[PDB]
Amino acid sequence: VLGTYKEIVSARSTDREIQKLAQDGGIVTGLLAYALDEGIIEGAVVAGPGEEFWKPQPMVAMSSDELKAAAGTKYTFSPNVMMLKKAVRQYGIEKLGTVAIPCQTMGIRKMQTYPFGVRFLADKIKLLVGIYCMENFPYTSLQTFICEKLGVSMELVEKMDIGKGKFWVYTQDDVLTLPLKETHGYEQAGCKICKDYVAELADVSTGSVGSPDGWSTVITRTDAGDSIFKQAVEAGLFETKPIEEVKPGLGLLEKLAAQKKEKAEKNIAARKEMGLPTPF
Amino acid sequence: VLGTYKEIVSARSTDREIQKLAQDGGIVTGLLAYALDEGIIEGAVVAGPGEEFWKPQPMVAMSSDELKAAAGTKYTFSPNVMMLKKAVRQYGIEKLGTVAIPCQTMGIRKMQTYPFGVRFLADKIKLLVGIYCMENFPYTSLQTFICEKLGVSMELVEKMDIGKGKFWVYTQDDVLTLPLKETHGYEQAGCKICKDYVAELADVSTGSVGSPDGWSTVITRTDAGDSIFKQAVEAGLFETKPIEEVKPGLGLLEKLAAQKKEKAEKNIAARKEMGLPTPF
Amino acid sequence: KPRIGYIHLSGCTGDAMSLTENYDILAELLTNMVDIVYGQTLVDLWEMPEMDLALVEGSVCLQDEHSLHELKELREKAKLVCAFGSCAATGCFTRYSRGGQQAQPSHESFVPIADLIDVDLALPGCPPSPEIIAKTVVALLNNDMDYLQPMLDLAGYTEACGCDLQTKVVNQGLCIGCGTCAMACQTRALDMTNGRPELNSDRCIKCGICYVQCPRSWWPEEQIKKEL
Amino acid sequence: KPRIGYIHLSGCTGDAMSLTENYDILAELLTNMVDIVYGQTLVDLWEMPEMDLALVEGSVCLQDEHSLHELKELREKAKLVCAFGSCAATGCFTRYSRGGQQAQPSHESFVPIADLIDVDLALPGCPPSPEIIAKTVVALLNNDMDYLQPMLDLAGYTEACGCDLQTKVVNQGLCIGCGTCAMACQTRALDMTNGRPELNSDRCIKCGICYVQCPRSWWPEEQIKKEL
Amino acid sequence: SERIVISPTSRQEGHAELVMEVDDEGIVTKGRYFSITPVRGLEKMVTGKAPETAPVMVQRICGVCPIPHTLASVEAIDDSLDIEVPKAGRLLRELTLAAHHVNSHAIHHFLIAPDFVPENLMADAINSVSEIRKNAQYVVDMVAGEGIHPSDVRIGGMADNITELARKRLYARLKQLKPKVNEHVELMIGLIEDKGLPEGLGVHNQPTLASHQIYGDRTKFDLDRFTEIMPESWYDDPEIAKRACSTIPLYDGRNVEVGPRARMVEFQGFKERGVVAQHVARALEMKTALSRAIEILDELDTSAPVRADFDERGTGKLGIGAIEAPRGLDVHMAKVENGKIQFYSALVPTTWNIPTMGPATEGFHHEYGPHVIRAYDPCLSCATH
Amino acid sequence: DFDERGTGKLGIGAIEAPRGLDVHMAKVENGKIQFYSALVPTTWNIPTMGPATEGFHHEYGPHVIRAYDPCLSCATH
Ligand SMILES: Cc1cc2nc3c(=O)[nH]c(=O)nc-3n(C[C@H](O)[C@H](O)[C@H](O)COP(=O)(O)OP(=O)(O)OC[C@H]3O[C@@H](n4cnc5c(N)ncnc54)[C@H](O)[C@@H]3O)c2cc1C
Ligand SMILES: Cc1cc2nc3c(=O)[nH]c(=O)nc-3n(C[C@H](O)[C@H](O)[C@H](O)COP(=O)(O)OP(=O)(O)OC[C@H]3O[C@@H](n4cnc5c(N)ncnc54)[C@H](O)[C@@H]3O)c2cc1C
Ligand code: SF4
Ligand code: SF4
Ligand code: SF4
Ligand code: SF4
Ligand code: SF4
Ligand code: SF4
Ligand code: SF4
Ligand code: SF4
Ligand SMILES: [Fe+2]
Ligand SMILES: [Fe+2]
Ligand SMILES: [Fe+3]
Ligand code: NI
Ligand code: NI
Ligand SMILES: [Zn+2]
């Protein structure tokens, strides 16, 4: 199931630019950008854009214009969380909000619970945003798909998204898709045991799944995130329609989340049966 | 007691140069140099002379003239044994003989027994020479003695030797001595547990103790070393007089060796009583 | 009222400073929150009273007669002995030391106090962040061990390379490349090459914060309660 | 007649080469001294016979289905399983690996075989010197375990930094600065600053030869018999 | 039809699985060779790590052809850095490479000897290879520190330079070795023909590649010509493409077989082609190597410095080092920025081969087909790294 | 940007620590330190502190020492 949440909605940011470049909803960029206006967050750390093509390197952007450049989806490790110490420390930020995969997200909260050598950082994060991640792959793992599978340069894909039951590459003059079952080997060994499809820890969680194309479903895990969201909707940046009403049913998203847990659980049994240490 | 040995003798090398610069007997330099003539050893690794003053840095000398420069005593760690791989490898040496403290000496034999990643080196050493060491001290530990204790520069001491019951510094125009009980803190923590006063492992062992000043007592642990020695005495390089006859009695040397064992043994009990790992 | 005792065997003393860092708590805290006894730095009574917990700043040194002598005394005196700061917990930068620097050229060996005496809990860091240290004290003061379960576990930890999260986790195939562990580097030795952590030894103090802060290394579901 | 089996899971294969190095023994040795079975390199039978001892060149990889599958088979097949070369014994240079190099970007984790299955003895080295490997085989063939006492002990060894003789020995205050361990570096990473060993990580493969060759780490009085 | 899978193929370093599609007669139709070894991942592990490391980690890629790997890495790095080895330093590298070719080839003979040599001979045959092998090692270890895995070669020079006493000691050993090696090849050459594998075995139309007979020239190489493509494209089967652990490196879009056979045809002039031909080529090839061994040795400065001092922090610019490994051409490209490698790529001689090997095992009855593969003497650990 | 490999020549850096003057001398040869020496502000003080605690009744005497606010960890390193 989903992690306990205040509410579930599917929403899109109003702005033309967010719709234009945002992967789905444009909610992460819109939600993050709005906070800047409100000032709940001084700056946020958003992955991209890296030296390689379609390679994300984490960057902390005070500027809204900068957040827009960051906005998009790159399916590779971008260790967002490395920045957090750097962002708070030099471009001194009293409160900073970051976009975190569920995975990174697991990493931050314990740290907020158990700083253990993070000084003063722990208080500083104001809004943490969690993006559902089924699996994500090494740049090379990713690179093979685009080329052996899709016969296109890394340069050409303007945007890449994993559509339900498929991988989609959007290139000027074309869209190319390959089945996920094709994808199965490549994602990192670490993710084999990643329990949380949704970001349970994250204050607000945004995902493509369970919402129509161009519509992003945002689920508000925690009250602070909820507040920021309520404020934004009042702002009218986002058009929100309750999730249950719009197909696909959020029950489908729930099923996807459940599937992930089934996958994690046996893997752990296998790792547990075997010698090698396991967290969880 | 002494390690099992073929014979005990007190001897001096004949040559004026060996007597002139050799610490005691001049046997190590004489024995090593002769082998070069005979050719049992292609080259040997002898500590000194280092970049610092009276600091030994190990050097492998094919040349006899070079061995003479090496000859002397420097009471500091010189890791002779580091060279052995280097000497055999580049200045390619089929058979190489080295002068080793008992301590180093312990290190080589196991290696000859258990090469474990030393290739071909193990066979190559032909004559290993062991020098009795009661204790030896870090360069700084040594440095304090010469200056706080003796009020002399490190430059001035032409030769430093530990006389029985004393430390002797020989400087042009003077000889300066301080009691060993003064010395007690400084020698390395490692030596606290060094069992072997004599070099039991070494093929032939040479020490000042138990022989009159300027006379060195050489005890032949093993047959190959014994052979090289028998050959040298036939050579007449060394004047040899059986040990028992000349005071001080080798029984005194034996007593000194015993004292060392008593010191090692309790230290080990203390280390054993305590958590920290111990070899031996 | 609860008695906290901190004895610094051989420590940069950052750990103590971190303790003073939690200012808002601090002024009241010594006065109201906690009782501090037998701290040479913070107090002047030479022989230690029994103390509810003892905080030991620095790695013990084998050679120094006093440090060893003091450590043995400490175990009886402190009902609970907790080693804090890496230097007590992991031996920290101390490990790099090779003795032979004057004066006292002999002192070359330092070991985490933990190896010498069983230690109830050690929380590492160089220093530990002030907040963690405050959180434990309130926790210890308020007597909850669901929270300190991770630390009780961490007492075992001892030697910790930067090198080790690579052996401990990335090798296991646990690592997901989140980047959390690099952020938890006081030294800043760790950094992330795509996407795994790559660290450069010239600059690692072996504090151990990176092994501890990886989500993968051990996940408390304790926190979930804390947010909500 | 005794059956020796060597299976190389993932190894530079130096270890096998070292085996051929002992030339004087070697030509006769396969023929007279020992029987070699189920070596893909040295023989062509696909499924392993029971073997008196099994020599495993390289660290197993968790991801690869075959290597793991093979390792499980090996334990039944080999009456005695011995892991040789650091790559089986300590995981060696393998540890540095972070997976993600094509093809097969996924394979990122390698572990010493020893962790997966109990291993009777492992003799490390990268490769092991030919002589040690010959000495063991004669020893194993001639059935003496006073000699192999150190190795049986070494099977436990697993992770080994260059860093570790500093923690394992120099810290303990054991080190006497003989210089033996630096000489036993295939990499040449170790070198002696006065007078202790100082090693530079950029160049250490974690083979573990330095911890093993220090006289201090473990002294056999076995050798004394060998000379005399 | 029926497809027979041999896994792993015997007598070659590492593991490769050969998959065959056969007609009723059993003449093969498609031969697929892929390396199923797990990737130790050196190319990646080196990245973001210091230049000083790169030669040490890299040579572990392959403990048989370690010297070529070390040489290539240093050359690639020194080139990116721009250090200039002094001539004695350069000569030492060439001298080591030659000793290595000689040795490596001998090791190959030991491995394939069982098919080739009668048992009565074989104990004697094996002994000789060990004899030739043992002398060659003396040179490789003596010049380059312990070898295999010599640690002595270093960026911009050699760690130290052999003493005249060492150089002399070496020479007699190499010069004296020359008669045995000459005879050894003839016996090997004599043996290989006797087997009489069907003529026309293992003939492929693939282009050969050589830079130099021993030491490789970077200049005679085209980044423009070169390309690397993942097995996923190249292989017929999804299963096989996924299984294969090795990228295929394409020369001018053409699968390329690079070998002693290739090194001879390009440089020596070796008109004959066959599997028997590859075998013949391996013998004469060591024959040539060993010569240079002694050649460079006689004229060696012995006091000229080996090390050239260099600046580790590097311009972004990438450099290529190509040297000829006993199993075929090799190149290392590295770019050093900030004194830590930013991009590292290695193409090992086997890597070039593995695509050509499958087409080679077609036609002749498959029992033959592993014979073709074994002729290439591939070492996978090199192919995959 | 700078070149790590260094001339043998030693250099001194002196900055004022809260407890008194401090200097670090280092010589870098081959890019690895060859001689390193640190004198920390307390180190300078410790000899002067003993003579300072003379005269006035000793109960006072620790007061003098404490005024210097020495940090030993600095003094000894
Ligand atoms: C690795 C990965 C896997 C995902 N898998 C799914 C999925 O299976 N189903 C699904 O519905 N949604 C998935 N998402 C998220 C989803 O695809 C949309 O990207 C996002 O949830 C919708 O936000 P948006 O419409 O506002 O897009 P945007 O406004 O473009 O928001 C995208 C934000 O994601 C951040 N980001 C990009 N790449 C990374 C990265 N590697 N790590 C951390 N942050 C990053 C960027 O900073 C950017 O600000 C995934 C995202 C990532 C990074
Ligand atoms: C650290 C140390 C402690 C010693 N303690 C004693 C003692 O207590 N009683 C005693 O009778 N003799 C002791 N000796 C040896 C003795 O003092 C004479 O040095 C030697 O035994 C006599 O040989 P010789 O007269 O031929 O002198 P030489 O011909 O001068 O022989 C001296 C040789 O010792 C080698 N050497 C010098 N320093 C070192 C070092 N640090 N490590 C290894 N090798 C070195 C040199 O290569 C030189 O070749 C000690 C030697 C050392 C190095
Ligand atoms: S699948 Fe899990 S471990 Fe992998 S990126 Fe997503 S959240 Fe992280
Ligand atoms: S006292 Fe023992 S450990 Fe110390 S130098 Fe002498 S032999 Fe070595
Ligand atoms: S743990 Fe860190 S801050 Fe504390 S004494 Fe040790 S080195 Fe200093
Ligand atoms: S926290 Fe762990 S998994 Fe995450 S980036 Fe760091 S080492 Fe990798
Ligand atoms: S990498 Fe950083 S956190 Fe990890 S042990 Fe080293 S100094 Fe500490
Ligand atoms: S132990 Fe060394 S030589 Fe053997 S496979 Fe491993 S890295 Fe190669
Ligand atoms: S062998 Fe051990 S004691 Fe001897 S020099 Fe090396 S590390 Fe130091
Ligand atoms: S320092 Fe040398 S011997 Fe020790 S582990 Fe590293 S590479 Fe091996
Ligand atoms: Fe490659
Ligand atoms: Fe100082
Ligand atoms: Fe190769
Ligand atoms: Ni190879
Ligand atoms: Ni200070
Ligand atoms: Zn380490």
Author numbering:
A (entry chain C), B (entry chain C): 2 to 281
C (entry chain B), D (entry chain B): 46 to 273
E (entry chain A): 2 to 386
F (entry chain A): 310 to 386
The authors write:
Refinement of this smaller dataset under otherwise identical conditions resulted in maps with better resolution than the full dataset, and the best map, with 6 frames averaged, extended to 3.36 Å resolution. All three subunits were traced completely except for a few N- or C-terminal residues, accounting for 893 out of 903 amino acids. In the new map, two nearby density features, modelled as extended loops before, were clearly recognizable as alpha-helices (194–201 and 208–215) that accommodate the missing residues. The resulting shift of residues brings the cysteine residues C206 and C208, which are conserved in the FrhG family, near a strong density on the dimer axis between two FrhG subunits. The cysteines of the dimer partner are just a few Å away, and the density in between the four cysteine side chains is strongly suggestive of a coordinated ion. The function of this ion is most likely to stabilize the dodecameric complex, but its location between the two medial FeS clusters at a distance of only 9 Å, which is less than the distance of ∼10 Å between adjacent FeS clusters in the electron transfer chains, means that a role in electron transfer cannot be ruled out. In the Falcon II map, the clusters are not just featureless blobs, but their tetrahedral coordination (mostly by cysteine residues, or, in one case, an aspartate) can be clearly seen. The FAD cofactor in FrhB has continuous density in the map, and its folded conformation with the adenine and isoalloxazine moieties in close proximity is confirmed. For the new Falcon-II map, we used an Frh sample with a large excess of F420, but the F420 binding pocket is clearly empty.
